[PDB]
Structures are given as structure tokens and as C-alpha cells.
Amino acid sequence: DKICLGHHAVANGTKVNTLTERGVEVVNATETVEITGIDKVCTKGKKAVDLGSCGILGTIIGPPQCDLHLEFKADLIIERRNSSDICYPGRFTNEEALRQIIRESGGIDKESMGFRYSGIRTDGATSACKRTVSSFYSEMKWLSSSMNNQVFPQLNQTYRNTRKEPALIVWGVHHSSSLDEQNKLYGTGNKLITVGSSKYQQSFSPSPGARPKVNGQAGRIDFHWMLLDPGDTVTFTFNGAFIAPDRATFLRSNAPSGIEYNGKSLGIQSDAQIDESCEGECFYSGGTINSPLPFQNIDSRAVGKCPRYVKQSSLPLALGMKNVPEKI
Amino acid sequence: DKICLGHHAVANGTKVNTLTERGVEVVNATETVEITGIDKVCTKGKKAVDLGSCGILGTIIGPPQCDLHLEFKADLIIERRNSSDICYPGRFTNEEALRQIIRESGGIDKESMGFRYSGIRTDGATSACKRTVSSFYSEMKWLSSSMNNQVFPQLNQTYRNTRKEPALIVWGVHHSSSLDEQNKLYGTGNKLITVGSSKYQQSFSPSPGARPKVNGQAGRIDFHWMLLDPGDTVTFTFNGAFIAPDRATFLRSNAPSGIEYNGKSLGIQSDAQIDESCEGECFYSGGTINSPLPFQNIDSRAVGKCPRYVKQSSLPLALGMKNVPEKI
Amino acid sequence: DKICLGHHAVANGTKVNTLTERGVEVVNATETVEITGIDKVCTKGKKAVDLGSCGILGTIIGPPQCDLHLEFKADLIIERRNSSDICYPGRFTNEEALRQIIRESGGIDKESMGFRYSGIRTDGATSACKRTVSSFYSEMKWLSSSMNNQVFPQLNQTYRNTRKEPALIVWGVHHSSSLDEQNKLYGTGNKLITVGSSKYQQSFSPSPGARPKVNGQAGRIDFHWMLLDPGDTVTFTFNGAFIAPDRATFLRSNAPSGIEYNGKSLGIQSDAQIDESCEGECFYSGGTINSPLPFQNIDSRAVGKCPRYVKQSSLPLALGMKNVPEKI
Amino acid sequence: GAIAGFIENGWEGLIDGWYGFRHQNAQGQGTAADYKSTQAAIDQITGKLNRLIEKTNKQFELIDNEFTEVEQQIGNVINWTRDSLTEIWSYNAELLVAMENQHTIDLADSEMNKLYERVRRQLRENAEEDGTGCFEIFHRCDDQCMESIRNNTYNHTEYRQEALQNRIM
Amino acid sequence: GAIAGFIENGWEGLIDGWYGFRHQNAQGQGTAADYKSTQAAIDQITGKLNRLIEKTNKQFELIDNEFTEVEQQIGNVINWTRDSLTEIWSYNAELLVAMENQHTIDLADSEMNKLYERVRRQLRENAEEDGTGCFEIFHRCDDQCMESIRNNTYNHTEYRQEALQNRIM
Amino acid sequence: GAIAGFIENGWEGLIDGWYGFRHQNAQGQGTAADYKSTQAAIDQITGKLNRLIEKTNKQFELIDNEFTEVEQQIGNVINWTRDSLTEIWSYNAELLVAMENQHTIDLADSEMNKLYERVRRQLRENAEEDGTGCFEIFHRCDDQCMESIRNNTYNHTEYRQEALQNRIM
Ligand SMILES: *[C@@H]1O[C@H](CO)[C@@H](O[C@@H]2O[C@H](CO)[C@@H](O)[C@H](O)[C@H]2NC(C)=O)[C@H](O)[C@H]1NC(C)=O
Ligand SMILES: *[C@@H]1O[C@H](CO)[C@@H](O[C@@H]2O[C@H](CO)[C@@H](O)[C@H](O)[C@H]2NC(C)=O)[C@H](O)[C@H]1NC(C)=O
Ligand SMILES: *[C@@H]1O[C@H](CO)[C@@H](O[C@@H]2O[C@H](CO)[C@@H](O)[C@H](O)[C@H]2NC(C)=O)[C@H](O)[C@H]1NC(C)=O
Ligand SMILES: *[C@@H]1O[C@H](CO)[C@@H](O)[C@H](O)[C@H]1NC(C)=O
Ligand SMILES: *[C@@H]1O[C@H](CO)[C@@H](O)[C@H](O)[C@H]1NC(C)=O
Ligand SMILES: *[C@@H]1O[C@H](CO)[C@@H](O)[C@H](O)[C@H]1NC(C)=O
């Protein structure tokens, strides 16, 4: 005349490790490592821009590529692999540092620096920036002697940062294809460029020579940038070889909530298409990672709100009591 | 006719998290994260020096600022924010690396390198180092032609590290305000400076030009330093533009316990006042952190014997049994 | 009339710490930290090479030192302390980065780049590379005017990477002892060297001067290297001062299993002798670390399959029940 | 065809609960899952896998660039630091899971005994332990008595004297 | 106004100890805290918060400069490495505390049962468990008998036969 | 010269096993180690020190050079990162050991009670607990009876009535 106390069991339960022992059979278990990712960028409910052919730094100075994205507003920014930051061969000083600024910008607003010129060619064009007809960077002016081989004027410019947000200022130094071309373009004799800000000063000189032909140009243009505090003057002084900013770049996450303001973007690097139907907060080169699980084995370098990255392909988590199969 | 076994409980116990469950009520608890700091530097029982206006590197070469601290002895060294390492505009090569040496030095002892000169002005003075009347770095000599525009002598100096502790040696290269000023000061023609040690050799030449006016000087002086093993000669050879060490700097934590010896300092950066009444082993920009607790949420970058830094403002630690309120 | 249940105990058991309590006495315990190492390199069952006097980078370009090891095949590679990578004073560009390539190479195979010359001295020899009689780098040719002070020919070379493995290519720039010596060697006038690859291009010019006398030479040779993808041409163009590769270096772990192939080496730095009797997978400057234990206190910087490094000299691990000494 | 409890066995048969009662008496054999202790085990188990999130998730950005490589000297260190941190996080996740796992396995064993101890104490002197997790009852317990044992209303006085004669001679 | 023990309840009344005895007999009602088991729980609890120090404290120096910034390329890495290490130390502290916390809560439950088991075994056959953590005593136990149960001197033979008649009929 | 069990004491005498039986009866005194529970404790203990390997071992290479120093700016960071990681791994090893140690000490206590509980349940109503970990047997148990208790064959019915008269009057 009896009563028995029992617990459930199943015939074929999964094996889970514990600190004490390995591969203990149990009633139920769940995976904790996410190993497959959504190969799309999941942008639903987010404001996203695909630069595509556009290099990111190019958004600042305007090659023909970046024509769409000069004043873009974005929560999520996607760089792409074959993208070229430049139309006329050159490279940014502190380039990797400059992009990281832009990725988290929110996007960028542009306003004119107000520069005007008296006796110079400002309309400099190149085979490199074609755009219906040969052209230049959208956001800059190329300055030339206005008569070939005519010695270029010692000029000075001051621009002062009126706005509350620190401005982004970019300028160029041109290294001419030949010692001749510098002469033809900027006249002859010593060439000096100096840039002055309350925190910044430096002097640049062309070092003219042939360099391997990229985009059909032996010549190079090098871009140097600065951040200008409000109420600060950047002074531009140059006898030539100088590529001049026409517009200042302002971050959108420094705006005063005056409706330009679109705060705090995440810039990712992705090979995947876009998808406004699915949802994501974690991204990697493959696509989005969205998962109930708390770890991923997919990519070390994933960015956004992400599952922790772990070496292991599986750690299985117990969801039920230890399984003790029934006896005869 | 009965006996009961019980445990205590209280009406309103604190909630603590456990691995299993969250916010379990319990009888007693203590905070484990320290979140308020003493905004003073707590130097009781320690030997401390506040450089104040003195930049730290300046202790080595003696601007008027650093006049008090030329031979300082310290367990704890406090740098300050507006402090200037230099009176006449220049910068140290490997500057950040040089300071870290000094912070942990214990302080520094000075002895003369014994240099003497024959036909030169050694008394070079500047508007920049005022000090009753225009002056120079306390620990160096400024060498000039002794007659304006007179071509400067090819000279050689050897100094050898007699002492057991490795000596600290600092020297200067002067970049003159104008191409003229170099001429007026050091004569005309090629200028070369070479510094030779058994582990060290390098050659320096002035690159004279105008630079933005700081302290009223367009000219710059650049300091280069070396560590000299015992029994090693540093050889100084120069035709001009050379700022010469008068004194060698010896760390106090390399002393032989011959009562100069004051071993192993911690150099901090602080905005806080000093207080010889309170006690501290952990410091940060705000002040000292002294606490019974084992974690701090106050500052990542705190230095000294410190509580571990954690993201969290609170983790409360149980000090008593689980609270089980009494029933009707 | 009774039965008792018991457990064993011993008189003098070891003390072990637990999370709860410290120095609990227990029946048995084992050490978990390894603190003594085998001061030999334990190479049993492994294919090992001791470069000895040979610097590692020297294997690529062949000083007399590295004569044995030009085409070495190794699983484990041991660098040594006084080893010199060079016979004629110079240094590799990206040197530390270059070695790390070699350490993990597996060894290296050499094949001739096929270069031939028309009107030049290629047999340049130096006091620095003695080898029965004065000599040069085994793997390079030193190119000279063939008549003293005769202006050197503008020449071009292209070599293309036929093999599947990326080739290693090294070249030299010679900075002559004096402005005279450059003239005597390479003739007079402007000297330019340019190196071109599909991913690589750069231009080098000698900057001739005296430098401190090492190996009896004021002059220096600087080595620059590149990795060449299959099917890629490196183009060599120079009017002089150029040290030319004779042989290309191919890694063995990029071989096609065509029996050159000896895959994946670990390069260590060791002061210890070699021993083919003992076995090891972890190495450090002292010797091998081989141990049943899972932690070592011996050296932070140990490399290979290693026990984790920990601050602590001991953590003792319980191997038996808590010891409860017997009572009266 | 006798019946045993948890000590030696699990019940593949119990399929509407985690813990349960198996009984036999004059009427026959019955099995009922117990709700409260099932829910108690289940509540502690759910929120696992949400607990592991919220302990191990972070917000981070690109330090190195895949598309154009940053300088190799620094590039090497960032790879080294990233791999070393992954070793640490891997160690941690495998440990945190093995903890949460030790904990589920153990607290389940815990809920079983919580329940059996309740019942032992509930039957006082009217029952005895066979030691398979079962109770031998020395009175006549019948399907409305069984539900009492279960529904926690078994009054041991009503049957004590019956049980004591039945137990001693 | 009956009295129960720890199983279901805590005593807000017990205020000079952690664990205690509550009794009633012919004389009335008494409560005494128990010293030894209180001290045992307390000793294990104190030294907490000193244990967490001495496991988590380090000596360190300035790697970056607040007053003049070091180079940004490296500067970024030092910030990245420092934040990543803080993630690791944060994870660790929240876990170490949740351990020490699981441990205090548990060992307390442990000291209670250590004590109750002692007493059960001490009373042998003279008492029975109501199951609220209380013992029903089948002999006449009086305030000098109670102190015996407590002070660990209760001799069960002196009362056994009395208790057995009182227990069986 | 009476004999007690594990509750208060360890047996320095038991030297061919971890857990054991100590008995006395009409024939005299005997001690036998118990094999199965010994092996059970031992199996869980062995594989310790192999478990710590395979959780904490890595493959790595030289990032800095001892023989020729890499640049000091970066050199400082690599030393800082390496020391900081060592702090983390040190913390971890001292914790992992203190866990495995808490676990060996505890599971041993666990195997003892597993065994004693078995025996208590095995003797049913024929024995009573002195509370030193010993059982007082109210029948005549003799060296072939003792081996039954041990070898898990003790049939409590064969001696029940004897034990009950012996226990009540
Ligand atoms: C048993 O564990 C599984 C997971 O192995 C749980 O099932 C998941 O349940 C959620 C909620 O419906 C679903 O979103 C997932 O798709 C399920 N995963 C799988 C693979 O089944 C289930 O809830 C657990 N149940 C019990 C009783 O243990
Ligand atoms: C209860 O916990 C508290 C902390 O919450 C303990 O009190 C601290 O006691 C020390 C020693 O006197 C004092 O230095 C602190 O100022 C106290 N802190 C606070 C906020 O009270 C107390 O010791 C514990 N007592 C018990 C019985 O749990
Ligand atoms: C007790 O612990 C020790 C280690 O303290 C164990 O002994 C080691 O045993 C292995 C296997 O024979 C040997 O390789 C080691 O040399 C031994 N070390 C030492 C210092 O003894 C032993 O196995 C354990 N035995 C018990 C019963 O606990
Ligand atoms: C138990 O049963 C007895 C039988 O008389 C009864 O008097 C009593 O009220 C019952 N209930 C309880 C909880 O004692
Ligand atoms: C228990 O009580 C009995 C009563 O006769 C006595 O003989 C004995 O000495 C007491 N003490 C113990 C510990 O048995
Ligand atoms: C126990 O002993 C009784 C004595 O009659 C016997 O009938 C029975 O078969 C024994 N075995 C078991 C397991 O009950």
C-alpha cells in the first residue's frame, strides 16, 4: 500500500558539460553560440546610407563618385571595398583617424567658407575628375596662375568658425607632375604654404616629381585636415600649389537639435546587400548578426551591439534536470 | 510540549543579486564599489613635491619656473596642468618617454659635467628666460661666436660617466629665428652637431627659419637626451648652434644608499590641493582614492596601489542570511 | 551491538585554499604551478636549426656567417644573442616585421632571379665580408662602374614571380663613405633608384657621408624587401649605388608538398644548448618548459604550446577529502 | 510490476510535469505530476539565456580597417591584443556556461528532495521509507487519501493509531 | 499563538543571535539565541570585503598623459585596450560578488540545518518533527530540560520510556 | 574504547580505502574499506590537473624581441598589455583552483553521506542513530550479518520483530 516520488526522464537526452564532469546527459538543452549570420545589412527602423563606389573620406571633398553623398544624414554608414576616396591621385594625412570621425558623425552638413579670389584661375579641371566634362573636387577650388608660367601671388585667407560645432576643414598641397608643370602652373621660384589655427600651425612645400601613373596622373594632391573650435580662425597663406577649401564640414551629432541634427552613427564595413525588412544591431563584413544567443563564433571584428566573440563553435546550455533513463 | 529551531529576520532587509537569482532580500549588506574620492592629494607619511607651474622635464634643464626643484627629493611627484617644461620655445625628443623616467626616479641629484670653454660667449641670455634680468636655462650654457658674424670654432667635448648610476645627459640644437640670426650668432657656412656615446650616435643640423611666435621667439631649441652607462664617454662635437649641458642628472633610486638615495617614486597628474593630514596610496586627477571597498567607479586611469576599476556604480555584497519576513 | 561509517584521515595533511576559507588542511594535494624549466632546447622528434652566430635576416642575403643556413629546412628555429644579421654595416627596413616572417617560414628555398649584366663590375668585395679573401653577401651582387670615376649606366631590370608561392625579394642602397667614394664607385651627378611592383613602388637615393666606423666601414648598405605575388613583376631601375638581388627567397610552408615543403616553424630566442633526447613544445630564453602542470611562473614571454603564465609561485590543488585528525 | 521513485530511476512515463507522485492502493495505480514544484524548477530555468545576455554584451567600433590596412607595426599589436582578449572571453564563456549548467542539474535534484522531505515529514509515523524514494503506508490509503498527501492536507492523526498497530505487530 | 521554526519562517523577535531556540512547556515560553552557531556563521562572513581586496588589487603607473596627449594612432589603441580590460574586470567583479553572495546565503541555510540535525539526533526517540522546524516532545520537558537540549547535554535515556508510552498509545 | 563515525572524526586507521565501515558485535571489532564509493570519489578526483590543462593552454609567438629591442613607444604598450593580461590570468587561475578545491572537499563530504543515507534506509526500523555517524542495532548482528549490511544485502524483515521488542521495552 505505497506512494512514490519521482521526476521525469526521456529516452535520448542531449549531452552537456559541467565544471565537475563532461558530457552529462540531460533532458533538454539549448545552444549558446550563434554561428550563422544574416548576409544582409539589416537596416529596418534605422537610417542607413550605402556609399558604394564612394570612399568615405571622399564625402568631405567631393569626387564625382561622392556626388550623391556630400551632405548625407545617416544612423548607419556602410563603406564598401573597391571604393576610392580620391579622383586625382593623392592621400589624406592621418587618413584612418579621419574616417573614424566621419563614421560616428551622424552624417555631415556643409556650408560655404566664403572665400573669394581676385586674379587667379580657380576653375582648375583634370582628366581625373571627369563629370560630363573634365572637372575637379566638388568642394574645393584648384588655383592657377591665370597665364601660363606667371609667378603666383602671395595670398592670405582667414576663415573663422562661427558655429558652435567644431568645423572640419580640408586643404590641399599639389605636387606637380614635373618640375616644368609646377612652373607652368604656379610660376617659378620658392613655393611655401602655411596653415595657421589657434591649436594648429604647419608649413608645406611641393616636392615636384614624376610618380607612377594612377588615373593617368603622375602628379599628386595631398589633403590635410583640421578640427576648428568655435570662434577660431584658420589662416591660409600661400604663394601657390595650394588646393583651397570652398566649404566647411560640420558633423550632425554636434548640431543643436535644430533639425539638421541626426545623432550618433555606427560606421561598418560590409560586403552584403541591404535589407530594410530585417532588424539588426550587430554587423560584420558578411552581413548582420542578430541572435537570441549570447555568443558568436562568426567574426572577431564585428561591430555594433554584439554577442561576445568566442573561439568555440558550441557550448551547450542545460535547460532541464539530469536525465536518468528508466530501469526494468 | 515543544522546541523550535529558528533564525533571525528583520522587517526591511536590502536586496542583493546572486548568480541564480536577482534582488534576493537579505538581512545585511555592504557596498563593494567606491564612488566618491578625497579631492586632495593625501601625502601623509610620504615625501611629496608639487611642481606646480614647473613642467616636469624642466626639472632637468632649469627654466626660471623650475628653480626650486632642480635637485628635488620625492616619494610622490605631482605634475600640474598649465605647467611649461620650457622657457625658450622648443620640445624634447622622446618627451613622454623621458618624463616616465623622472616620475619614478625618486627625485634627482645634479653634479657638474666639468666643461670649460676658451673663445666663445657662453652667457647667452634671452627675453624668454627672464629672472631679475634676461637669462637662460639654469643647467645649460648658450654658446655664441663672441663677436657678431664671426665663424664658430670646430670643438670637441668628452664627458665620461664616473658614477655607478647611469647619468642623464641633455643637449640642445638651436634653430635660429632667421637665416640671418644663425649667421650673426654662429657665423656662416655649414653647421653640423654630432653626439657620440658607446650605445648612442647621431648628427644634428639647424634648419633655420621663422616659426610662430611663442614667448616672443620665432627661434626654437630642441633637447635630446641620453642615458649614459657608468664608465662611458659621451663625445660632443659641434661647429655651432649647440646648447651645452653644464650638469648631469642622476636618479636618486640608483644611489648606493649614501643618503642621497631616496627610492622609487610614483608620479601622478592631479588638479587637487595637497593634504599631509589624510593618507593615500591611490591617486587620480580628482584627488586621492582611499577606501575599504575593493572596486572603484571613479576613474579608469587612476594610479598607485588601487581598487580595481569597474563600469558599475554598485554591486552590493551580502553580509547576512537570506531574509525571510515573519508570518502570522 | 553497533556499526559506524567513516572516512580516512592522515596525521599531517597539506593546506589548500578554497574560495570560502584559507589553508584548509586536506589529505592530499598537488602543485599546479610549474616553476623550474629544462635549460636545454628540447628538440626530440622535431627538426631544429641553431643559427648561432648567424643573425636570422642574414639567412636571406648571405654574410659569411650564414653560409651554412642559406637554404635551411626547419620546424624549430633558434636565434642567438650576439648574432649579426650583416657583414657590411647597414640595417633592414621593417626589420622586426621581416624576421617574424622567417621564423614561421619552415625554412627557405632559393632560386636564381636570372639577372645578367653587360658593362659593370659585379664582383664588388669588401674587407667587411672576409671569407678566405675579401668578399660580399653570398646572395647579392655589388655593382660598380668598371673604371674608377666613370659615370654609371641608367639600367632597368624586370623579374617576374613564376612560382605559386609569393617570392621574397631583397635589394640594397649603398651610402658611400665619402662624397668622393660615391664618385669613385658610381661616377658623378644625380643618383636615383626606383623599385616597382604591382603593389609596390618607391624611389631611393644615396645620402653619402661618414658614419661611425663599424666593421671598419664608414659606409652603409640598407636593405629593403618586398613580397611578390605570383605572376608579378618587380622592376629594378637605377643609375647606381644599387645592391642587386641574385636569388629569390621562397618560404617552405608555401610549397606544394613537392618535397621542399616542410611546413610551419616556431622561431624562438634562446640562451640554452640543444638536446635531441628530451621533448618540448614550449620554449623560453632559459630553455624548454615541459610540465604536467597547467601554469608556469617561469617567464611571461614564453612561446610555443605553453602553460599559462601566472604571477603566483604556488597554487596548491586538492587531491583528497578534507583532513579531520582522529580524536581520543 | 512494483513501483519505485527517484532515487534510482527517472520516469519516462511522467509527461505533464517535472516531478510527480506514483501510488498504488486497493483501487489501483495512479500518477500525477506536481505543479508547484514543476513551476518552481521551470521559473529558475527560464531567464537562463537571457541572464547570459546582459552579462556579456558590449558596444564597440572599428579600430582597424579591413579594406585598407593600417600600419603593420601597430597592426600586429591590435591582432595580438584582440586574440589575447578572445582567449580570455572564451575561457569565461565556457566557465559561465559550465556554472549555469552545474546549477540547473543541481537545483533540480534540490526540488525533488524539497518535495520528498515535505512528504516524509507530512506522513510522520504513518509511513516508512523503502529507500527507492517511496513511502510504505501502514494504513489503508485510498484515492481520496492519496490526493490528500499530494494536495498537502494529509492529517496524520486520523490514521495514526491504525498505522501504529499495523507497524509494530 | 503556537510556535514554529525556520522551515517556513524567520523570527523577527530573535535579536541577540543569528540562530535560536524557541520552546514551550508547562512553565511557559522561552527564546534563546545560540552562540556557537552564530559565531560560526559570523566568522565565515567577516573577512568578506577583505577577501575581495587582496584578490583584485594592483600597482600601476601612467601610460598615457592627460595634460599633453601622446600620439593619436597609439592613443586610440591604449583607450581601446583599457576599455576592453575594464569590460573583463567588470564582468569578473560582478561574478565574484554574486559568488560570495550565493555563498553567504547558502552557508547560513547550512548552519541552521547543521544545528537542527544535531538536535534531531540528540532527541533520538523522545521527540518527533512537526515539520515547521519544531520538535514535539513526548515527555515532560521543563526549563532545566530545555537548557539541556540546548547546552548539548540532553540524555535521552532518562526520558526514553516515558516518551515511548506517551508516543505509542 | 567505543567506536564513532565520520561526524566528529576521521579514521587514521582506515588505510585501504577512502570510506569505510567500523563495527562491533558479539564476535569483536572489524574495519573494512568500501570499494565502490572510494572509486567513485577517486574517479571524480582523477582527471583534475588534466581538466586544468585543456582549459588554459594556448599557441603563441614572439611579438617583441629580447635580443634587439623594438621601438620604445610601442614597446611600453606591449609590456603594459602583457602585464595587464597576466593580472587577468592570475586572478583566473587562483579562482579556478579554489573552485576545483571547493569541489573536491565538498563532493567527498557528499560521498560519505550518500553512503550513510543508503545504510540508514537499509536498516529501516532495526537500527537507530547514535549521531556520531554510527548505527545502534537492536538485534544480534554477527559477522555474516555485518557483511550483509555492507555488501548491500541486509534484509530488514529477517530481524525486524526481534529489533522491535528490543527497541520498545
Ligand atoms: C527545451 O529546450 C528548447 C531549445 O532546445 C526550447 O525550445 C526553443 O523554444 C523557443 C520558444 O518557442 C523557440 O523560439 C526555439 O525555436 C526553440 N528551439 C528549439 C531548437 O527547440 C524549449 O522551450 C525547451 N522546453 C523544455 C520544456 O525544456
Ligand atoms: C552589517 O553591515 C554593515 C555595512 O552595511 C556593517 O557596518 C559597517 O561597520 C563598520 C564597522 O563598524 C563601519 O566602519 C561602517 O561604517 C559600517 N557601515 C555601515 C553603512 O553601516 C555591520 O558591521 C554589519 N553588521 C551586521 C551584524 O551585519
Ligand atoms: C596524491 O597526490 C600526489 C601528488 O601530490 C600524487 O602523486 C604523483 O603521482 C604521479 C603518478 O605516479 C607521479 O608522477 C608524481 O611524481 C607524484 N607526485 C608526488 C609529489 O607525489 C598521488 O597520485 C596522489 N595519491 C593519492 C592517493 O592522493
Ligand atoms: C487532524 O485529525 C484530528 C482527528 O480528530 C482532528 O481533531 C484535527 O482537527 C485534524 N486536523 C489537524 C490539522 O490536526
Ligand atoms: C544517561 O542516563 C542514564 C540513566 O541511567 C545514565 O545511566 C547515563 O550515565 C546517562 N548518560 C549517558 C551519557 O548515557
Ligand atoms: C526478506 O526476508 C523475508 C523473511 O521471510 C523473506 O521472505 C524475503 O524474501 C526477504 N527478501 C526480501 C528482499 O524481502
Side-chain angles (χ1 to χ4, degrees), chain B residues 1-11 16-20 22 24-26 30-32 79-81 95-96 99-100 103 266-271 285 291-295 300-312 315-322 324-328, chain E residues 3-6 8-14 17-25 45 48-49 52-53 56-68 70 82 86-87 89-90 93-94 97-98 100-102 104-105 108 112 115-116 119 130 133-137 139-141 146 149:
Chain B
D1 208 329
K2 197 183 234 185
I3 200 154
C4 294
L5 262 69
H7 59 53
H8 71 90
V10 307
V16 309
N17 300 19
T18 64
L19 174 63
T20 59
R22 183 177 177 83
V24 178
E25 194 169 298
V26 293
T30 189
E31 182 51 76
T32 45
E79 316 181 31
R80 298 253 171 248
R81 183 179 296 178
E95 44 167 280
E96 206 56 49
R99 312 186 166 122
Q100 292 168 351
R103 310 167 148 150
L266 179 82
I268 67 172
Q269 307 184 283
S270 183
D271 288 355
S285 48
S291 183
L293 296 174
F295 311 128
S300 298
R301 308 186 44 261
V303 307
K305 279 201 53 175
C306 292
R308 186 67 62 183
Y309 173 73
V310 304
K311 290 196 312 167
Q312 305 109 334
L315 305 154
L317 182 75
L319 285 186
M321 71 196 48
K322 158 166 189 45
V324 175
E326 191 155 21
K327 185 65 173 170
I328 303 76
Chain E
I3 63 190
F6 71 88
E8 51 155 339
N9 222 335
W11 299 339
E12 297 193 16
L14 169 63
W18 279 25
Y19 311 112
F21 300 94
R22 184 168 279 181
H23 73 55
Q24 64 180 20
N25 51 2
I45 273 47
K48 289 263 231 298
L49 185 92
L52 299 118
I53 320 188
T56 73
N57 293 101
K58 45 58 126 210
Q59 179 100 23
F60 266 86
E61 71 281 5
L62 292 168
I63 191 169
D64 45 347
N65 188 317
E66 183 165 335
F67 297 157
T68 58
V70 296
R82 189 181 294 126
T86 281
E87 293 270 286
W89 280 110
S90 292
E94 175 168 354
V97 175
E100 295 288 8
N101 279 353
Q102 179 69 245
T104 293
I105 282 195
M112 188 83 272
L115 184 50
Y116 175 104
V119 169
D130 69 345
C134 280
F135 282 105
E136 284 170 7
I137 309 189
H139 66 73
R140 293 182 183 174
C141 198
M146 295 294 193
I149 278 172

Side-chain angles (χ1 to χ4, degrees), chain D:
Chain D
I3 63 190
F6 71 88
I7 303 301
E8 51 155 339
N9 222 335
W11 299 339
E12 297 193 16
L14 169 63
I15 64 186
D16 55 332
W18 279 25
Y19 311 112
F21 300 94
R22 184 168 279 181
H23 73 55
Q24 64 180 20
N25 51 2
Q27 290 74 358
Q29 247 174 254
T31 298
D34 175 68
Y35 191 86
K36 184 186 183 67
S37 66
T38 299
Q39 213 68 322
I42 288 193
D43 278 18
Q44 277 159 89
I45 273 47
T46 81
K48 289 263 231 298
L49 185 92
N50 189 346
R51 191 175 304 109
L52 299 118
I53 320 188
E54 308 312 321
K55 286 180 67 172
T56 73
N57 293 101
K58 45 58 126 210
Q59 179 100 23
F60 266 86
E61 71 281 5
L62 292 168
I63 191 169
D64 45 347
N65 188 317
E66 183 165 335
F67 297 157
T68 58
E69 303 90 359
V70 296
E71 164 59 358
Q72 173 205 16
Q73 296 174 336
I74 191 66
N76 226 48
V77 170
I78 296 198
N79 290 5
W80 176 77
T81 303
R82 189 181 294 126
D83 290 33
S84 305
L85 294 197
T86 281
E87 293 270 286
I88 295 191
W89 280 110
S90 292
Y91 172 93
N92 290 8
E94 175 168 354
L95 199 88
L96 183 96
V97 175
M99 271 187 273
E100 295 288 8
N101 279 353
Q102 179 69 245
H103 168 246
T104 293
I105 282 195
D106 272 4
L107 74 80
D109 275 34
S110 159
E111 284 295 344
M112 188 83 272
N113 300 114
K114 201 169 301 142
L115 184 50
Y116 175 104
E117 220 56 7
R118 159 163 95 62
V119 169
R120 182 183 57 78
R121 293 210 245 264
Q122 206 179 351
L123 294 168
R124 301 274 304 253
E125 230 61 31
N126 303 6
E128 312 199 334
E129 298 181 349
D130 69 345
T132 52
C134 280
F135 282 105
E136 284 170 7
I137 309 189
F138 283 86
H139 66 73
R140 293 182 183 174
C141 198
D142 73 309
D143 282 18
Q144 183 172 352
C145 178
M146 295 294 193
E147 191 176 35
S148 181
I149 278 172
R150 291 197 232 101
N151 74 12
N152 209 70
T153 67
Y154 181 83
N155 187 353
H156 72 116
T157 301
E158 182 173 336
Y159 313 78
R160 183 185 180 91
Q161 296 306 321
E162 171 175 6
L164 289 188
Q165 61 212 8
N166 260 325
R167 241 175 97 209
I168 289 170
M169 300 306 293

Side-chain angles (χ1 to χ4, degrees), chain A residues 57-285:
Chain A
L57 280 183
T59 54
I60 291 103
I61 68 194
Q65 293 165 326
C66 289
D67 271 333
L68 307 142
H69 316 299
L70 298 180
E71 286 189 71
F72 79 91
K73 183 194 303 189
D75 283 302
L76 172 76
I77 293 165
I78 322 177
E79 316 181 31
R80 298 253 171 248
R81 183 179 296 178
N82 285 339
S83 56
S84 164
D85 284 276
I86 62 100
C87 66
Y88 187 100
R91 66 177 37 240
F92 269 87
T93 198
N94 219 12
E95 44 167 280
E96 206 56 49
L98 187 44
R99 312 186 166 122
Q100 292 168 351
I101 295 194
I102 284 299
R103 310 167 148 150
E104 60 191 344
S105 54
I108 45 189
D109 170 42
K110 304 270 197 43
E111 171 170 305
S112 178
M113 283 181 70
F115 286 154
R116 253 203 327 117
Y117 300 97
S118 296
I120 293 100
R121 293 173 68 86
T122 77
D123 59 354
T126 190
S127 147
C129 294
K130 205 168 129 191
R131 190 184 302 204
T132 204
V133 297
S134 287
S135 178
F136 200 55
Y137 296 109
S138 166
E139 311 298 45
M140 293 177 182
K141 306 237 148 282
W142 195 353
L143 314 178
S144 305
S145 296
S146 66
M147 291 177 72
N148 271 206
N149 265 93
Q150 182 179 359
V151 174
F152 199 83
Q154 178 80 221
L155 292 176
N156 44 80
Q157 281 134 19
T158 58
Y159 174 76
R160 197 183 151 232
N161 179 357
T162 301
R163 313 182 56 163
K164 281 66 197 174
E165 49 243 41
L168 177 56
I169 296 314
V170 200
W171 65 84
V173 162
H174 178 214
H175 307 260
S176 315
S177 159
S178 54
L179 178 53
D180 281 341
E181 285 298 319
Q182 181 167 312
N183 291 1
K184 163 190 240 201
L185 286 185
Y186 314 100
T188 313
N190 292 77
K191 282 321 162 227
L192 178 65
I193 320 161
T194 166
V195 174
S197 181
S198 296
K199 183 60 167 63
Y200 191 119
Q201 182 110 20
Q202 264 264 2
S203 63
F204 305 103
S205 63
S207 63
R211 298 177 185 83
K213 183 178 179 180
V214 168
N215 267 22
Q217 310 306 114
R220 299 286 185 268
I221 297 190
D222 286 354
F223 302 83
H224 312 297
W225 56 281
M226 73 157 307
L227 282 148
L228 208 74
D229 303 2
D232 196 354
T233 63
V234 59
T235 295
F236 291 105
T237 280
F238 56 96
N239 41 319
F242 177 70
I243 316 290
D246 187 35
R247 294 165 71 185
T249 296
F250 289 99
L251 308 191
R252 296 209 179 250
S253 76
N254 289 333
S257 285
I259 64 100
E260 207 93 55
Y261 172 82
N262 176 275
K264 249 340 215 43
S265 62
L266 179 82
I268 67 172
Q269 307 184 283
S270 183
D271 288 355
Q273 299 177 49
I274 277 194
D275 178 273
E276 332 212 350
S277 63
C278 85
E279 189 126 38
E281 302 267 312
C282 183
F283 317 93
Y284 80 116
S285 48

